[PDB]
């Protein structure tokens, strides 16, 4: 999962 | 109407992942905060999320909930998950929005 904006 | 019930309402900012330029962009297009439902059809109880643009109503968010999605809570106003297709993120108004969100996308992962 990608990182939080 | 007729065949979905609400589960829940929460404010959040949607977002979808763009992995070819490998950065976070507001779902349908622009930049503001939504109404999220998650939806149960009670007849083949199924659920999807929906999402409309408080400002103008666009639909910007409307996708399955399958059995067995990994729901990630990155942060607590921060959620995300994905499908084949997308990665979805939701940026909550508040910490009770996401508690509102996520307990109800919890109890439909465990009765699907």
């Not at chain 2, 929460?10 to 503001?32: E, L």
């Not at chain 2, 995300?80 to 997308?86: E, L």
Request: net charge positive; hydrophobic share 35%; glycine share 6%.
């Amino acid at each position: 999962x990608p990182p939080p904006x | 109407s007729m065949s979905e019930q609400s589960i829940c309402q929460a404010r959040a900012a949607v977002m979808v992942y763009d992995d070819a330029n490998k950065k976070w962009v507001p779902a349908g297009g622009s930049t503001g905060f939504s109404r999220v439902h998650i939806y149960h059809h009670t007849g083949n109880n199924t659920f999807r999320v929906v999402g409309r643009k408080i400002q103008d109503h666009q639909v910007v968010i409307n996708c399955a909930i399958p059995k067995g999605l990994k729901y990630n809570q990155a942060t607590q106003t921060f959620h995300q998950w994905r499908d084949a297709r997308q990665v979805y993120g939701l940026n909550f108004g508040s910490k009770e929005d996401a508690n509102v969100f996520a307990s109800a996308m919890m109890h439909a992962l465990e009765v699907l």
